[PDB]
């Protein structure tokens, strides 16, 4: 099970580095910067499409997998939420394609790309639902093979998209990578025969829909905080300097997201299920502290190694046209430690399913990101964004400990 997840995370990382490298070598810092706001929208779609209930889907599919009547209502209401929201999403993308292009790119020259997303997001919503269902039925193999195939065809789709369409093709490729996974997930769901197909018939259970709505509010809150913040910050950096300067700072985040993904799963399936079962404050503190005793030195060592080979990392994963960001590593990699450090406090809020505290944590990150950006970015450029990213999580980590200590007492 956990080795299936490792296989998925590995192929996903390798393919992500591969497509990230090809995008860098082909379109340079201007392309990496211009594409970042578009890549921010795709990940949000993976978070907030099909009502963003797929975390709750897997939880309740496994909870009611023994009761056939309640299992059918869970999958049935999940398909209904996906169908309704995927269709409304399509209408939103065809009618507001120009204003969405403006917010993401600064001009309306990407309307056709935004309108095409209306069809692409359907594969993301339906694909992630089929993956969530396979996770709920404890099918780690069917989940992993679907992700591996989806990553393999995503590289093929991205290569053909950018060769034909140019830069806007490469952007379409970045959306097609998570959307095409619905092809192997569907084929795997069929032949593995774990889930009856009639269960996918859209029905509506007001009980499960309201409970699954709480997962929708989480994705809603998540999608309109840090993504919105990072969008305005890259836009302000581009306006005061250039999109080429945004790609300098974007290359730093793109390099860190590689090793920061494997460490994420090291305290995801190992920490989140454990923090849910425990109920005593002493036992909560005994695992919050002991998780930091492993997570902090692990990211510190990994990030320090990246800074030790900052020149090699730039040359390897990107191009020597990104050499200017070697000075950004010290500030961003520090902020990475404090950000992942505060993740332990974030997964504690998710384990308690506290919407109140989840809202407070996301807006805290959003605010600190916005204040520190209006001061650093207009003066220091990409270094200002890397300094705002570090100043944010230096304060946010310290606030997270104070909030935890008050809550602990």
């Amino acid at each position: 099970a956990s080795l299936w997840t490792a296989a998925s995370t590995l192929v996903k990382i390798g393919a992500g580095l591969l497509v990230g490298k090809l995008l860098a070598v082909s379109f340079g810092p201007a392309g990496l910067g211009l594409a970042a706001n578009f890549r921010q929208l795709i990940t949000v779609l993976g978070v907030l499409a099909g009502a963003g209930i797929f975390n709750g889907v897997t939880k309740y599919v496994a909870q009611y997998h023994d009761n056939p009547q309640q299992l059918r209502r869970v999958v049935g209401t999940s398909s209904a939420m996906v169908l309704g929201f995927s269709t409304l999403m399509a209408l939103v993308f065809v009618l507001a394609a120009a204003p969405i292009s403006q917010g993401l790119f600064g001009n309306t020259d990407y309307q056709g790309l935004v309108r095409l997303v209306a069809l692409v997001q359907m594969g993301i919503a339906w694909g992630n639902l089929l993956l969530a269902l396979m996770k709920g039925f404890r099918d780690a193999a069917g989940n992993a093979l679907s992700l591996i195939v989806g990553s393999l065809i995503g590289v093929l789709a991205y290569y053909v998209s950018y060769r034909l369409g140019g830069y806007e093709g490469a952007l379409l490729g970045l959306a097609l990578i998570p959307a095409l996974v619905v092809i192997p997930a569907a084929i795997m769901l069929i032949k593995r025969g774990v889930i009856p197909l009639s269960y996918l018939k859209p029905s509506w259970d007001n009980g499960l829909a309201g409970q699954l709505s709480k997962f929708t509010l989480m994705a809603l809150i998540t999608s309109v905080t840090l993504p919105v913040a990072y969008i305005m910050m890259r836009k302000l950096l581009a306006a005061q300097y250039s999109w080429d300067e945004v790609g300098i700072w974007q290359g730093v985040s793109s390099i860190s997201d590689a090793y920061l993904q494997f460490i994420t799963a090291s305290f995801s399936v190992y920490l989140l299920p454990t923090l849910s079962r425990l109920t005593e404050k002493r036992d909560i503190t005994r695992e919050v502290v002991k998780s930091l005793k492993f997570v902090l030195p692990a990211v510190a060592a990994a990030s320090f190694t990246v800074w030790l080979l900052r020149d090699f990392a730039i040359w390897l994963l990107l191009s020597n046209k990104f050499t200017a960001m070697r000075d950004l590593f010290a500030w961003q990699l520090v902020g990475d430690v404090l950000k992942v450090g505060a993740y332990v406090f974030g997964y504690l809020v998710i384990a308690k399913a506290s919407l109140r505290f989840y809202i407070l944590a996301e807006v805290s990150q959003f605010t600190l990101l916005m204040v520190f950006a209006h001061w650093l970015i207009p003066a220091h450029g990409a270094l200002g964004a890397a300094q705002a990213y570090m100043a944010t999580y230096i304060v946010y980590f310290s606030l997270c400990c104070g909030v935890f200590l008050l809550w602990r007492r």
Partner: nanobody
Amino acid sequence: QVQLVESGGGLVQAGGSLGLSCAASGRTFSNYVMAWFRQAPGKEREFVARISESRGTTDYADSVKGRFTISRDNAKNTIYLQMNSLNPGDTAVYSCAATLPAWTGIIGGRRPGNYPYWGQGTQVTVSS
């Protein structure tokens, strides 16, 4: 950062002619794929003409083919657009655009989103 400056435009009688020039301040100007785009109030920037970065191959919209001509002068970092046989359907804000060959692909040479560097735009108006 390649930056472009438009020059030209203004009033012109229907059927007449007008020349439009774009000047670029940047390195290795001959490496760039250069193009002309136009746009009416509210519409998306529409392709007009494009000139390659190597042999100088040109490409024109179906609505300007035969009337408009694009050309480049790599020694002066400028491109040109000679517009002949002007009709009211050519009243738009014309912009010059620069990009590298990889951004265009094989079929993406006419989409404005494949051009990251843009000029200021100049007004062109045809009478009747």
